[PDB]
Design a protein around this ligand. Structure first.
Ligand SMILES: [K+]
Ligand SMILES: [K+]
Lengths: 8, 766
């Protein structure tokens, strides 16, 4: 449900 | 003849329109000029190489195939030379007063005995003779910088919230009341990624979406792209914003976070330097070269990164006094019954002998001792310290960017950007004018956090007013809050005998005309207005609707009638029939916002509107589309979003813009999302006693500690937030133990230094 496209 | 019409204003030659004369003037006035920093020369790179994830956006024509990035072996000093119009050598159509309207007003005064007619004509003529719409001058801009420095460091130097006596948590408890917020939508991404990763593009309209904030395509790109718009530099902005947040995150978790973070901040110094844009306004001719307001035009990548923190929270937080039990005016509209809701709240306060406070950014409204006070921060933005913005960042990350279980909706990299670097990129940083890199005093006006930071400063002034036992705004005791808070302010309006004035407004309401008996005519004798100047609006009582309706404050109405803003959009101006459509829009909008209630103005504007519509029929051009979408053509467009000007204005138009969707019961307003049962007064009395110094939540305690620890400790801080931001098994007890551990190492005073000062040092490194 939450957008999760690896994080900066 | 030529006596009725005042002469066009011709601005004097500007002796400070050269870098030498400008630098000398600032030096003579002890204004800080920075040692100029250079930007690496632009390199034309393949967008597919720089943004591989968006290769599909390039081939579908949504991005340029090439991206220009500052990567060159040589460098350049940026130069920004804004236009100032009108000027000594160009007195044209831009900033031209509405002389046609002045002629029409005089003719109708000759034929109609309107009791307010002579005063309306004199006011419009005096505004044409003493005001000038335009972008001022270099002298105006330079003198404005001195006035900003004066507010920040002069008679009443700025104070951080800590100096005033508030912790981040104590301020957050006040903001829960003065600025109630909701969390961003569950579907919205957390603060964990590079901006370009918020673009989901493949081609499929059913799935394709951008989670990035909306930007004004025609607005300035800022540094390092002078002469370019945001639409021109979309790819460039993503590349730069991506690289900055990624390089910052990596540097903070490196073997030497101090050298690493400082290197990244100096490499991207230009992301903290705003173009000093002259603001287009209705300036006083006599002070044309003394005051030009400035827009601190933030670089596109900086604006994008800041907006990713604020806009997902504020989109969900349109909470104000008309729909929530809060003093906040955020998202207020006086239309569709908004003004009547305010008048109901005011009337109930007066009947129950209760004081009232309302807040909107740098505007404070106080109702006490049967009097209405309008208090404005003096040159608001100049009073802002990086620490004020840091406290706002604390409030957004603890109350907004938080999951229901209390875990953070951000990672250590985004906590570093928001808490440790971002406040010094747009507060007490620098600006560019000509080839001069000048110091900025306070927050840059126009940055993404302008409203939020100003609203926090007004919250501090209001909290101190409550603490001091609500002293009357006209007393020394109230004016003493300037020194106590480090925030300059002035009483802009005093509306005495408020109860009596409201009774007079209702009793003098006309029986004839618009919103009275419902005929399409202004009243011969308008009723008494309740001149609240509530975000520029006064209240007038309507007999037809049996409610108060807004009318634009008289001085604003007259200035706008004397000096209308033209079409300030090249693209729309280029379209055929747009310029003649704008002409109709100008006269209809001035009527809509309040001219309808001025009989001379309404008779002259109606005539102008129908004559312009008749000229359109003669030429045979269809402007229906422009008249339906009139909002983008008018300075008053941002209110009446769902109305069309294709048909001439009638009494039904005025009824529609004032029609409420629902009936209003002030007692039925929901309480604030946080501390619902507590009033602002109960919160202030708790803070006075020393309550809420530290948050109970360990995640929030880590964020507060982050504002006190130096940049060399960032890797240790990242390790402390990692369990909570990753939501690992038993993250709460782990964050609890890590916070307690971090609190102990804070007994080393060598570990205590503001990262905001460290950021400012690195930004100003040569
Ligand atoms: K100040
Ligand atoms: K409350």
């Amino acid at each position: 449900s939450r957008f999760t496209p690896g994080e900066v | 003849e030529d006596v009725l019409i005042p002469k066009r204003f011709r601005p004097a030659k500007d002796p400070l329109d050269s870098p030498q004369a400008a630098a000398q003037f600032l030096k003579d006035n002890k204004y800080r000029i920075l040692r100029p920093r250079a930007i690496p020369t632009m390199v034309e790179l393949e967008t597919d190489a720089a943004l591989p994830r968006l290769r599909q956006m390039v081939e579908d024509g949504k991005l340029k195939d090439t991206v220009s990035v500052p990567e060159g072996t040589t460098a350049f000093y940026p130069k920004y030379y804004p236009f100032h119009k009108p000027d000594h050598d160009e007195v044209g159509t831009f900033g031209a007063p509405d002389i046609t309207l002045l002629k029409q007003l005089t003719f109708f005064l000759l034929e109609n005995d309107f009791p307010t007619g002579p005063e309306t004509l004199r006011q419009v003529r005096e505004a044409i003779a003493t005001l000038q719409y335009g972008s001022g001058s270099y002298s105006g801009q330079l003198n404005r910088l001195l006035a900003m420095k004066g507010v920040a460091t002069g008679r009443n130097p700025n104070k951080t919230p800590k100096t005033v006596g508030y912790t981040n948590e104590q301020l957050a408890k006040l903001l829960e009341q003065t600025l109630p917020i909701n969390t961003p939508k569950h579907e919205d991404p957390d603060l964990r990624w590079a901006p370009s990763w918020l673009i989901n593009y493949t081609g499929d309209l059913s799935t394709d979406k951008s989670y990035l904030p909306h930007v004004t395509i025609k607005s300035s790109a800022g540094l390092p792209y002078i002469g370019k718009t945001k639409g021109d530099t979309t790819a460039e902005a993503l590349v730069l914003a991506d690289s900055f947040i990624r390089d910052l995150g990596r540097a903070a978790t490196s073997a030497d976070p101090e050298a690493g973070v400082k290197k990244t901040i100096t490499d991207f110094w230009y992301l903290s330097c705003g173009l000093l844009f002259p603001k287009g306004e209705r300036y006083t001719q006599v002070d044309w070269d003394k005051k030009t307001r400035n827009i601190w035009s933030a670089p596109y990548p900086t604006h994008l990164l800041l907006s990713m923190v604020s806009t997902p929270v504020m989109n969900e937080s349109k909470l104000n006094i008309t729909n929530t039990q809060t003093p906040s005016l955020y998202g207020f509209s006086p239309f569709h019954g908004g003004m009547d809701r305010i008048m109901t709240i005011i009337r109930d306060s007066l009947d129950n002998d209760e004081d009232l406070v309302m807040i909107y950014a740098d505007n404070i409204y106080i109702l006490q001792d049967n009097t209405w006070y309008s208090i404005d921060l003096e040159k608001g933005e100049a009073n802002c310290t990086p620490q004020h913005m840091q406290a706002m960042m604390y409030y957004l990350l603890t109350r907004g960017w938080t999951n229901e279980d209390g875990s953070p909706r951000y990672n250590p990299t985004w906590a570093t950007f928001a808490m440790n670097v971002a406040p010094s990129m747009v507060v007490d940083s620098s600006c560019l004018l000509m080839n001069l890199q000048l110091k900025t005093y306070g927050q840059g006006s126009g940055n993404a956090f302008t409203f939020l930071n100003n609203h926090l400063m007004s919250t501090i002034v209001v909290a101190e007013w409550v603490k001091a036992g609500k002293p009357n705004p006209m007393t020394k005791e109230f004016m003493d809050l300037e020194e106590k808070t480090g925030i300059n302010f002035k009483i802009e309006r005093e509306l005495k005998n408020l109860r009596e004035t409201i009774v007079e407004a209702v009793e003098t309401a006309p029986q004839d005309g618009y919103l009275a008996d419902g005929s399409d005519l202004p009243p011969i004798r308008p009723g008494k207005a309740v001149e609240l100047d509530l975000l520029g609006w006064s209240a007038i009582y309507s007999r037809q609707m049996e409610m108060f309706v807004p009318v634009l404050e008289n001085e604003r109405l007259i200035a706008s009638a004397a000096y209308p803003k033209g079409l300030e959009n090249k693209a729309l101006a280029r379209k055929p029939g747009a310029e003649i459509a704008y002409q109709i829009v100008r006269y209809e909008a001035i009527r809509l916002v309040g001219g309808w209630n001025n009989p001379l103005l309404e008779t002259a504007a109606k005539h102008m509107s129908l004559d312009k519509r008749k000229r359109l029929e003669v030429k045979g051009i269809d402007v229906t589309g422009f008249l339906d979408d009139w909002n983008n053509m008018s300075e008053f467009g941002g209110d009446l979003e769902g109305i069309t000007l294709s048909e001439p204005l009638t009494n039904q138009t005025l009824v529609d813009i004032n029609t409420p969707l629902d009936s209003f019961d002030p007692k039925a307003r929901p309480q604030t999302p946080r501390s619902p049962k507590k009033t602002l007064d109960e919160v202030t009395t708790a803070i006075t006693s020393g309550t809420y110094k530290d948050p109970k939540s360990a995640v929030w305690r880590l964020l507060d500690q982050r504002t006190k620890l130096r940049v060399s400790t960032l890797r240790d801080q990242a390790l402390a937030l990692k369990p909570a931001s990753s939501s690992v098994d038993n993250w709460a007890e782990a964050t609890e133990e890590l916070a307690q551990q971090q609190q102990l190492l804070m007994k080393a005073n060598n570990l205590l230094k503001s990262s905001l000062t460290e950021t400012r040092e690195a930004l100003e490194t040569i």
